[PDB]
Structure 1
Amino acid sequence: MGDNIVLYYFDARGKAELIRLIFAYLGIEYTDKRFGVNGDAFVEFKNFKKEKDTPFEQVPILQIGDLILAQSQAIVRYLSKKYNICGESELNEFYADMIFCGVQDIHYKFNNTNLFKQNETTFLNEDLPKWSGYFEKLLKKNHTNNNNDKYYFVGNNLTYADLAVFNLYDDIETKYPSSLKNFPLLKAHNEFISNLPNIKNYITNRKESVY
């Protein structure tokens, strides 16, 4: 609100990419500060915590004016509620929330998956297909036949849940094969969201990050 917007995080997608996608979709201009660009990523982060008054010594940290906001999920809901992309009814606000909570679950699982731990096949053969099925079924329940051209998990308008699900699979795809092949609506939903003007432009401009 007439205040300089500054997002603080490491030079990576991680837990800040959904926030970035929200700004990109909303056309909100802000300073995307990334650690590890000026100097040692962890030296910068250490000094950051010294200069900024963070509640839990974690990033992302979103600063609006002199207002300091922490916790990625809280930030996402805060921005979504303020910019009306969280549902237009007490029930829909809940559904978008419930879907995001689900996203967090499987997204965490993905980020906890790696060769060293020998849990890659489980994630690929058990966990991902199961959750993809959950999301496929949720998308179907929000009747797509009405206006097929549009794919939304909640109501008839885009919510942060749509961006969260997209970001989930977008992140997974950077490391593992595209499996959406077996989930039509979901596959369609992701294509739809990615091709949105603001989103499509954003993606094309962001640099490739390993994390």
Structure 2
Amino acid sequence: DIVLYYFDARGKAELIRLIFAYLGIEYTDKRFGVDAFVEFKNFKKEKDTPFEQVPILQIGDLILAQSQAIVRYLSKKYNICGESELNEFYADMIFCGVQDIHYKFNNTNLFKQNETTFLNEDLPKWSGYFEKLLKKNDYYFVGNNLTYADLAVFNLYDDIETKYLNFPLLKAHNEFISNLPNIKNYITNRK
């Protein structure tokens, strides 16, 4: 009854956009800076944010902040969080793992001279963790249905691939998500 507010970037909003695309939920994708910064300063004046951060998801009059929290909330509401107490935990635990490596990716750049370590050490290591998780479990990380963890893992590699998959299941899992019809469409349309 929905507005997503963020910068004109994937960033930490993209996973939320992927969820809405998957669920088929209509919303206004509001992007600053399509002086992004002046616009953000104004938004903060206009809107009551808890921590002066975006993304913000506003549903009617209700303001939701913090991307990971928003993801968990939506996932519960729309049945992509796992179907048992243990499965809900595993999905969460996997997402936390994705968060660790995703941040590391966002902390690697040329100036810092950490690209080679990321490419050679950190990413292979994390990819191995994910591949093993897939092996343990027309591919899902959790149970026999899609969860937000699947989308998160797709999003992580999709992001990484923009800038910079030895991992057979992970590759297959990524292809599978990319080809879900709602996802494929979203992706094709995406700037």
Give the TM-score taking structure 1 as reference length. 0.89
In the alignment, the residues of structure 1 paired with residue 11 and residue 90 of structure 2 have an alpha-carbon distance, to the nearest angstrom, of: 24
In the alignment, the residues of structure 1 paired with residue 149 and residue 60 of structure 2 have an alpha-carbon distance, to the nearest angstrom, of: 27
**Structure 2 residue 148 is the aligned partner of structure 1 residue 160:** yes
Which SS does the other structure have where 2:42 is aligned? helix
Which SS does the other structure have where 1:118 is aligned? coil
Cα deviation digits, residues 101-125 of structure 1 (max 9, x gap): 0000000000000000000000000
Residue 70 of structure 1: how far off its partner (Å): 0.2
Residue 75 of structure 1: how far off its partner (Å): 0.1
Cα deviation digits, residues 22-77 of structure 1 (max 9, x gap): 0000000000000002xx10001000000100000000000000000000000000
Residue 92 of structure 1: how far off its partner (Å): 0.2
Identity %, equivalent residues? 99
In the alignment, the residues of structure 1 paired with residue 70 and residue 109 of structure 2 have an alpha-carbon distance, to the nearest angstrom, of: 28
Structure 1 stretches of at least 4 aligned residues deviating more than 2 Å after TM superposition: none
Which SS does the other structure have where 2:129 is aligned? helix
In the alignment, the residues of structure 2 paired with residue 175 and residue 194 of structure 1 have an alpha-carbon distance, to the nearest angstrom, of: 18
Which SS does the other structure have where 2:5 is aligned? strand
In the alignment, the residues of structure 1 paired with residue 150 and residue 160 of structure 2 have an alpha-carbon distance, to the nearest angstrom, of: 16
In the alignment, the residues of structure 2 paired with residue 183 and residue 117 of structure 1 have an alpha-carbon distance, to the nearest angstrom, of: 27
**Structure 2 residue 48 is the aligned partner of structure 1 residue 53:** yes
TM-align CA RMSD:
0.9
Residue 174 of structure 1: how far off its partner (Å): 0.1
In the alignment, the residues of structure 1 paired with residue 106 and residue 61 of structure 2 have an alpha-carbon distance, to the nearest angstrom, of: 32
In the alignment, the residues of structure 1 paired with residue 78 and residue 39 of structure 2 have an alpha-carbon distance, to the nearest angstrom, of: 31
Which SS does the other structure have where 1:19 is aligned? helix
Residue 184 of structure 1: how far off its partner (Å): 0.2
Which SS does the other structure have where 1:117 is aligned? coil
Task: Return 5+ residue gaps in structure 2 as ranges.
Answer: none
Which SS does the other structure have where 2:26 is aligned? coil
Which SS does the other structure have where 1:13 is aligned? coil
Residue 86 of structure 1: how far off its partner (Å): 0.1
Residue 161 of structure 1: how far off its partner (Å): 0.2
Task: Return 5+ residue gaps in structure 1 as ranges.
Answer: 142-147, 177-181
